[PDB]
UniProtKB/Swiss-Prot annotation, chain B:
The lineage of its organism: Eukaryota, Metazoa, Chordata, Craniata, Vertebrata. One of its GO terms (cellular component) is endoplasmic reticulum membrane. Found in neuronal cells throughout the CNS. Expressed in liver and brain, and to a lesser extent in spleen, lung, kidney and testes. It comes from Rattus norvegicus. This is Fatty-acid amide hydrolase 1. It holds the Pfam family Amidase.
Length: 544, 545
């Protein structure tokens, strides 16, 4: 009773193999025509310089394309981050608009970004052999700006997870240590970019899916305000859930790259292709500002106890910001627990899981999802009874469980109203301390494989800003030291529930892995957030 | 068990009388200190010139304030459009920021725009004696730009209606003919501005509530894209309904005024007070463009048969645009009936009316609501049975009724998704014909009092753009002729149901009343819409430019 699923996995395994084979052939042929091309010099250029050399004509597009293509092919051996080669892109190379802001840049794409003639499976058998009739809007805009989307990258099954495995393409691994998750759901992009095989990628984020893989794999990522960029044409799994919106944004090796991507996407082409997006140009002057900042900060969210590395990262960044002349102010958004347990959970699962679950009918469940699916299928009443049982022991479990029940349209209105007033509440705190930006810990170091779907509470640092729909980005600032890692033996967590226990074991054995912080600004202030991210980058990682 | 409602109406009647008295006193005292002030010269200035003279210091703020105040007090006699005098505002006059874009402009405000120390009752007894503890965001921005909000204006009970009566302040009347509705729910503003007693006002719109009273009272109004301006601090009655969004926007006697209001509100002060609003400045160059336009048009929406005046208005505007060198293209959004009956109705009433109905516990129901409330209180199952009965006879009635039922969050998701795809479908048609803007009929002439709440189908022209969330404005272009009015005897409507029958009678006896058209652009293109509206104004009514 699983024939479709097995068939799907087989076809998908075939298409992946054949893609990688095609890539290999093209790269090998290119290398024999061009033996005297310093490939490693090219691959290490910062994107901004790559772009400039592509504009001047000092580097051909073919040279940049096929060098990255080889590099991608190579890093994929140890990572399994590539699902498909976007076959028609050698043709796109030659047609690439010449004064485009990203002329000749190979760009990687999370699998959900629809591409003409390719599946966006999301690891789900339901969506195998259903190729896309057209490119999604942001892909078109990337093309119109001269970029060359060249690969689809892997995602955890359904994309609802901060790990990166599915039953079609299997398991993506962290390029810093193969026992570790690369993060998710944009984990493919994090593994690729973070092992040096794509200079620029796009991902999506509803609970942290740009920020986890960026932080875990040691790269920069930005999740904008939800309707700053076009979601039109993106492949999804739940339709019409507007309480917690989905956002999309760039991942790259430096902050300047993320700014360039935004500057390039926020142009007339996007605004006329999706008029539902407000036509807010990129404000150069705000991104380049060097005025002192008033910076809110917290060391812990009092929900997910941070690892010693997180905490050291946060504090060091804080101190260096202080020394560079910024004012640092303790700030914690009010009622985090209710924002996570009631608003975030209730909005993502207002219908009890029913619509989401449809995507899994007849399909296997990748074990990286843990018991999420099992739990969602439970009758409403039993979720309630179970919630009453656990409440005195493990109230956090009891709260997530109870707020995953189905409900009426009337209660969804009340919930949407609460989401709105919570948003206004935090804006008011922020204005009362007169903050410009906010600095927070970011989950890290990378967790062991198959642990993120058993440490749901650890989304606390990131999901808060999906609920608030504030822009939020991450910047790698240090690496785990032997000291940091030994200290994990003293980690206990605030709740002592299964999610605290898993997280403790999961963040262990992590010496050498990157750790980040998170930078947040108010709605529609992507440019300021990037400015602050740019500053954190200069102060903690000067050599670049 | 009606005592609180009667008490409420009595207190509210008192506060309204006392407000009007205070206004009268101040105006009379001002006139005697300043006998040599040409008042009528001042009242007829176009806003733009008013403003310029206020900036140069050729006219003092006191002079402009008190003159409008007297005019408001006077027109209110025949219209009952003013509920409260915003008593604070003589002290606001002297504090008014000098380089503000609206320095010294008196501005009228629909009752729901919260003002510190005044009730926003919405005609509902539940909200009487509950004064607002702060100004709403747009009122603060108006103040920071030097404007002087001076009155609250009347609304129909709950604000959910295109008529303008309630049990607290009573019934607002059209200043062109007192047997007629002024429109609503921003009817107060329409009656006040339209009788020359406020140069600039703000209203709100969820099914047409800026565009009805603007068209019915002969003034310009614009309903922006829903999140172009801040709704923060506005007084409502339903919370969390996001499928069909509420919008707010200006009403004034010319298009230029509406542009100035937007230019003034879309400023740092608004963007920092409500960061949820995208900080899209007013694009002067787009509003001032004089490039030819590609203009979609339709003459009827095939749902609400237009009155002969509507139809003449639409066609004349079309022809004049054609002669001015614009291209006119036939365009009708797809599936209007489903947009109104399923998406619009379902999104406004996804919970069956229950949240809305709460606002009416223990309160009288203004007869200008008709049977809306009675119908909403009906058990879900009886709404269904009734819907199945009427379907073969009067399918339109059957559809509105069935889509007012409660439902789960799962079905609301599906509805929200359909709303989203509907929005994209119409964008795609628009792009396939390569339109810049769209010209449509607008409901008119004004209906008889207590008829709008029995002609629900007639919101078809306006509500379509609340569902799509496109900017949409109205510009008066002509007046009902005796020929137009006689033709109403030939009006049948497309359905022949009770809504068609009521509408026929209700638009009769309307000679001399203004009629408008509607101008629509894509989301976030308020400036282009205003450019088009400016063009329609120029061509049909050259004198206001
Ligand atoms: C169809 C679909 C499904 C998921 C996503 C999506 C896009 N981006 C992301 C990531 O941010 C998800 C991180 C995991 C969040 C898990 C949070 C959670 C809350 C409550 C209970 C369990 C888990 O996912 N796009 C489209
Ligand atoms: C609490 C509240 C209630 C109403 C409003 C509001 C703002 N603007 C408007 C007007 O657009 C109302 C126009 C009339 C719409 C009636 C439409 C209707 C559809 C389906 C069935 C019956 C009637 O109202 N703001 C706040
Ligand atoms: Cl928006």
């Amino acid at each position: 009773g699983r024939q479709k699923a097995r068939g799907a996995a087989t076809r998908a395994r075939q298409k992946q193999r054949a893609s990688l084979e095609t890539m290999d052939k093209a790269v090998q042929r290119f290398r024999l025509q061009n033996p005297d091309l310093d490939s490693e010099a090219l691959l290490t250029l910062p994107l901004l310089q790559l772009v400039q050399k592509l504009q001047s004509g000092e580097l051909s597009p073919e040279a940049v394309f096929f060098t990255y293509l080889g590099k991608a092919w190579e890093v994929n051996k140890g990572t399994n981050c590539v699902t498909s080669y976007l076959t028609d892109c050698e043709t796109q190379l030659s047609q690439a608009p010449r004064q485009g802001l990203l002329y000749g840049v190979p760009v990687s794409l999370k699998e959900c970004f629809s591409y003409k003639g390719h599946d966006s499976t999301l690891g789900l058998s339901l969506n195998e052999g259903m190729p896309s009739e057209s490119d999604c809007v942001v892909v078109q805009v990337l093309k119109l700006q001269g970029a060359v989307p060249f690969v689809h990258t892997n995602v955890p099954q359904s994309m609802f997870s901060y790990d990166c495995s599915n039953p079609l393409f299997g398991q993506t691994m962290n390029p810093w240590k193969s026992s570790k998750s690369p993060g998710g759901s944009s984990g493919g992009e994090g593994a690729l970019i973070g092992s040096g095989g794509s200079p620029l990628g796009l991902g999506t984020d509803i609970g942290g899916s740009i920020r986890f893989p960026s932080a875990f794999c040691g790269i920069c990522g930005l999740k904008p305000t939800g309707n700053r960029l076009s979601k039109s044409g993106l492949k999804g799994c739940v339709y019409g859930q507007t309480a917690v919106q989905l956002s999309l944004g760039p991942m790259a090796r430096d902050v300047e790259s993320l700014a360039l991507c935004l500057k390039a996407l926020l142009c007339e082409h996007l605004f006329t292709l999706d008029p539902t997006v407000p036509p807010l140009p990129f404000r150069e002057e705000v991104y380049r500002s060097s005025r002192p900042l008033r910076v809110g900060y917290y060391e812990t969210d009092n929900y997910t106890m941070p690892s010693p590395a997180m905490r050291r990262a946060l504090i060091e960044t804080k101190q260096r910001l202080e020394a560079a002349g910024h004012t640092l102010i303790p700030f914690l958004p009010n009622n985090i627990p209710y924002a996570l347990e009631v608003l975030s959970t209730g909005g993502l699962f207002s219908d009890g899981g029913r619509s989401f679950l449809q995507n899994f009918k007849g399909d296997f469940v990748d074990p990286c999802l843990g018991d999420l699916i099992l739990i969602l299928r439970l009758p409403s009443w039993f979720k309630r009874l179970l919630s009453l049982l656990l409440k005195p022991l493990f109230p956090r479990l009891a709260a997530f469980l109870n707020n995953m029940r189905p409900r009426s349209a009337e209660k969804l209105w009340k919930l949407q109203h609460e989401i709105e007033m919570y948003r206004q509440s935090v804006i008011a705190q922020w204005k009362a301390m007169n903050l410009d930006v906010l600095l927070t810990p970011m989950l890290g170091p990378a967790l062991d494989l198959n642990t993120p779907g058993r440490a749901t509470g650890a989304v606390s640092y990131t999901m808060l800003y999906n609920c608030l729909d504030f822009p939020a980005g991450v910047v790698p600032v240090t690496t785990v030291t032997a000291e940091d890692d030994a200290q994990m033996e003293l980690y206990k967590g605030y709740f002592g529930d299964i999610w605290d226990i898993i997280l403790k074991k999961a963040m262990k054995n992590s010496v050498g892995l990157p750790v980040a912080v998170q930078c947040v600004a108010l709605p529609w202030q992507e440019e300021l957030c990037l400015r602050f991210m740019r500053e954190v980058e200069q102060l903690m990682t000067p050599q670049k």
